[PDB]
Every structure is written in C-alpha cells, then in structure tokens.
Design a protein around this nucleic acid. Structure first.
Ligand SMILES: [Zn+2]
Ligand SMILES: [Zn+2]
Ligand SMILES: [Zn+2]
Lengths: 28, 54
DNA sequence: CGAAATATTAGC
DNA sequence: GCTAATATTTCG
C-alpha cells in the first residue's frame, strides 16, 4: 500500500525504509 | 552559492526554496482556496487544505 | 539544473 | 485534524 514501513515502537507508517530509519532514531 | 535568508539568517537548498521561506517574513500568501478564501504560502499546503472540504 | 511536488515534521 | 514550514524526492 501507500506506506509499507511501520515503526514497531509508536506505530507510525512511512513510504520508504529511509524515512522510517530517521524517525526510528528519535526513540533512542 | 548558498541561498541564505539575508534578512533572517536561515540557509536553503535553492533560490526558489528561499522564495518560499521569505513568505514567512513578508506575509505573502499567493495560493487562495476557491471555496472558503483561506490563503496559503505554498501550493502544496493549499492542495492538502482542499481535502478538508470534500 | 533549479523549480516543483511531495513527504514529513512541529505545534496545538 | 489542520495548519506552517522545510527536508527530500521528483520533474522537465
Ligand atoms: Zn516511532
Ligand atoms: Zn528568514
Ligand atoms: Zn477552503
């Protein structure tokens, strides 16, 4: 679908692996 | 060349990007919704706003 | 290439 | 949700 990459911590979805990666850092 | 806001100090990726940012200082909002008349600084934000009407 | 579009983010 | 702003991607 539209945003296949999902953050398992907060559940937000993203269009690319890279966008997920940069967001995932904010949980560290 | 760096496209810096000489009048606020922020740097931007292109001249047209500086353009869009300068509107935050001048109050220029060239994109007006045809339904309710709300004005926006960018075409993209007006486009999203139209989806709040349909 | 830089302009334009799009995705995202911050704020409330 | 809905805005304001900008970083990233896309485009001709
Ligand atoms: Zn998350
Ligand atoms: Zn400025
Ligand atoms: Zn409107």
């Amino acid at each position: 679908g539209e945003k296949p990459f999902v953050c398992n911590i907060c559940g937000r979805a993203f269009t690319t692996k890279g966008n997920l990666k940069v967001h995932y850092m904010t949980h560290g | 060349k760096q496209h810096g806001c000489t009048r606020c100090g922020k740097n931007f990726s292109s001249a047209s990007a500086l353009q869009i940012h300068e509107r935050t200082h001048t109050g220029e909002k060239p994109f007006v919704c045809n339904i309710c008349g709300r004005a926006f600084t960018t075409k993209g934000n007006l486009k999203v706003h139209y989806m709040t009407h349909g």
